[PDB]
């Protein structure tokens, strides 16, 4: 499930992807961050 | 899959939030969906 959203901005509407996308990635590291080591190894 | 497109639209950047944001919400329901009863206990 490889996916890559290249940077595409025009003006003020570009800020949408920047924040939106940025949130997605952060969501992964977060959940997958503790959900991967919730009880250590 | 995407069809019916106008010859000139002043919102090509809007599609960013639509997809980006839409993905975020879906990410929650997904993870929180199985992570709510994963392996039962």
């Amino acid at each position: 499930e490889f996916q890559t959203l290249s940077p595409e901005g025009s003006g003020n509407l570009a800020v949408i992807g920047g924040v939106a996308v940025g949130v997605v990635l952060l969501l992964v590291l977060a959940g997958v961050g503790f959900f991967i080591h919730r009880r250590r190894k």
Side-chain angles (χ1 to χ4, degrees), chain A:
Chain A
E1 280 100 83
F2 258 82
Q3 294 290 124
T4 44
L5 287 310
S6 67
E8 312 216 71
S10 295
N12 290 290
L13 291 311
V15 187
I16 307 171
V19 181
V21 176
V23 178
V24 188
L25 295 152
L26 200 291
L27 200 169
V28 179
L29 279 301
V32 190
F34 163 90
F35 181 37
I36 193 110
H37 289 144
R38 53 258 158 72
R39 291 128 186 287
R40 306 233 277 164
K41 55 134 197 137

